[PDB]
Amino acid sequence: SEEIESLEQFHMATASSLIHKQMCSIVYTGPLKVQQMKNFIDSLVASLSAAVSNLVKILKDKFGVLDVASKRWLVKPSAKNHAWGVVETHARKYHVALLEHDEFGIITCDNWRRVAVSSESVVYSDMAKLRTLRRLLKDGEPHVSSAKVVLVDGVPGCGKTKEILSRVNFEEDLILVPGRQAAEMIRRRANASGIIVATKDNVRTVDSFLMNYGKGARCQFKRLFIDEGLMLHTGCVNFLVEMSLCDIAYVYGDTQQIPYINRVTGFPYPAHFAKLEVDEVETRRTTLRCPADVTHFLNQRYEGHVMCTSSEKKSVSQEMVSGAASINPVSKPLKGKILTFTQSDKEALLSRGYADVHTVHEVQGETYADVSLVRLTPTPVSIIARDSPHVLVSLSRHTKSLKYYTVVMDPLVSIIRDLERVSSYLLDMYKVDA
């Protein structure tokens, strides 16, 4: 619509003008918050340079390439309807272009010879964010909010989302969260009493907020609530606080809930940048959900002791399955909520006839009485590691029981096995009244 027009600064810009083979010798100046915000912008500039640069590299010698004249692909991409790509003209020049699509594919121009797209150009979120963030800068200098920022450092099931849902005034405040799944769950839980108080305006994903800032809706809020703010670059949090025009912001965070990872190759994100600067730090170390054994595990991953209000002591168990095929709804029904680590395993169980299956990642923040966790892939699964955020999440959803069914030995089998062996009297030491 009118969004493509808002990104005109990027349309047909030379690929070279957006590429920066450096961003390692960058020296920031000013207050810590300013440096973090500057650094956040550069992480976006660096992520875009890499995306544009790889598209050009592909043209020079997922990563799809289109022949303009024949309207047929030389290399078919995995995704569809990419929002942008790099164009190679007949003079062999490289320009970034915001793409349009019709019944027959990409709408092209006569002077375009080939067009390259990739997983990174599927969406123009980086450009969208740059556009928004750069308009807030006066000569590269971002404005820092005078609002008080309170950080609530918590653990699984301590009440991060519950507190937000309990304290927010849906008519004046804003709740920002990373990921659509989380945003949808928050709205659903907020609207569960029967009335819709949580909408697309007072509950938004971080990406949507950054990308569509100004496009309308509403911009000024009295208080800002961020659920899982430690999943974001510190400079991003600084921008969100300022952009919400709030007088106070509550950043609910969790150091083990998939913390913000640089990801950008050779991009600098020093330890002093990774630490959020707030006016007050609050701590939550009592889980109101997890059993005492899962709590023992949590104590191992968090600074500070973790206590539990729950009376449940031991709740985990597992089972090694010989024949992956034996795991079917008739042979062995799976109690409660059925979860898997990968999509492939998820599809498998669904085709086998199991009802309502989701991946661990798809149920972040959710609670269940009983969980049946399943691994059908005997091949290596990277996200299943002793210190993996997915494992942490996978062990902290249930209030009553968790059973892990796997076709192969892995770090999770060890964790569950060790938890089953610990003394129950030791486990009692985590108990608190509440």
Partner 1 sequence: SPRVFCIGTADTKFDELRFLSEHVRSSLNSFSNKSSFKVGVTVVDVSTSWKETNSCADFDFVPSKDVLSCHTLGEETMGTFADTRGLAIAIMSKALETFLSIANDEQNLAGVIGLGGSGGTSLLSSAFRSLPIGIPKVIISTVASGQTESYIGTSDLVLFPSVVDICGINNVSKVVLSNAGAAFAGMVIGRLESKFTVGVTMFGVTTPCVNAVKERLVKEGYETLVFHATGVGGRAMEDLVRGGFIQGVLDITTTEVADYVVGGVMACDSSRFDAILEKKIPLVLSVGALDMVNFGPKTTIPPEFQQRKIHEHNEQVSLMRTTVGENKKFAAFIAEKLNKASSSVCVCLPEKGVSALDAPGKDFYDPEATSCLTRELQMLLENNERCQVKVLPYHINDAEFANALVDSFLEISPK
Ligand X SMILES: Nc1ncnc2c1ncn2[C@@H]1O[C@H](COP(=O)(O)OP(=O)(O)OP(O)(O)=S)[C@@H](O)[C@H]1O
| Interface residues toward Mg ion, by CB under 5 A | 160-161, 299, 365
**Is 161 assigned to a binding site?**
yes
Q: Does 304 bind partner 1 (CB under 8 A)?
A: yes
Min separation Cβ 418 and partner 1, Å: 4
Cα radius of gyration (the chain): 24
CA distances from 111 to 7, 66, 73, 87, 245 (A): 22, 14, 17, 10, 46
Place of tokens 């009493």: 193
Q: What is the DSSP code (8-state) at residue 125?
A: H
**Is 340 assigned to a binding site?**
no
Q: Which of 27, 423, 433, 434 binds partner 1 (CB under 8 A)?
A: 423
Calculate the dihedral angle through the C-alpha atoms of 298, 300, 305, 309, rounding to the nearest 10 degrees. Answer: 30
**Is 295 assigned to a binding site?**
no
**Is 159 assigned to a binding site?**
yes
Q: Which of 142, 159, 291, 389 binds ligand X (CB under 6 A)?
A: 159
**Is 162 assigned to a binding site?**
yes
C-beta closer to ligand X: residue 185 or 407: 185
The number of C-alpha atoms within 13 Å of 128 and in the hemisphere containing its C-beta is 21
C-beta closer to partner 1: residue 30 or 266: 266
**C-alpha–C-alpha distance, residues 167 and 152, integer Å:** 14
Min separation Cβ 357 and ligand X, Å: 19
End-to-end CA separation in angstroms for the chain: 53
**C-alpha–C-alpha distance, residues 5 and 100, integer Å:** 12
CB 395 within 8 A of CB 310: no
Q: Does 161 bind ligand X (CB under 6 A)?
A: yes
Min separation Cβ 28 and partner 1, Å: 19
Min separation Cβ 236 and partner 1, Å: 26
**C-alpha–C-alpha distance, residues 84 and 390, integer Å:** 32
DSSP character string of 272-330:
TTSS---SEEEE--EESSS-HHHHHHHHHHSSS--EE-------EEEEE-S-GGG-STT
* CB-CB neighbours of 191 under 10 Å: 15
Q: Does 235 bind ligand X (CB under 6 A)?
A: no
Q: Does 404 bind partner 1 (CB under 8 A)?
A: no
**Residue with the CB atom nearest Mg ion in the bound state:** 161
Min separation Cβ 151 and partner 1, Å: 19
Min separation Cβ 257 and Mg ion, Å: 8
Q: Which of 102, 110, 263, 425 binds partner 1 (CB under 8 A)?
A: 425
Tokens of 400: 């009553």
Q: Does 187 bind partner 1 (CB under 8 A)?
A: no
**Is 189 assigned to a binding site?**
yes
Q: Name the helix (H) or strand (E) containing 105.
A: strand 105-106
**Is 397 assigned to a binding site?**
yes
C-beta closer to Mg ion: residue 66 or 203: 203
Q: Which of 47, 295, 359, 399 binds ligand X (CB under 6 A)?
A: 399
**Is 419 assigned to a binding site?**
yes
Per-residue contact flags (x/-) with ligand X for residues 342 to 381, judged by CB under 6 A = -----------------------x-x--------------
CB 126 within 8 A of CB 47: yes
C-beta closer to partner 1: residue 156 or 178: 156
Min separation Cβ 371 and ligand X, Å: 13
Q: Phi first, then psi: give them for residue 307, nearest 5 degrees.
A: -110, 170
Binding residues: 157-162, 189, 288-289, 397, 418-421
Residues that bind ligand X (CB under 6 A): 154, 156-162, 257, 288-289, 365, 367, 396, 399, 418, 421-422
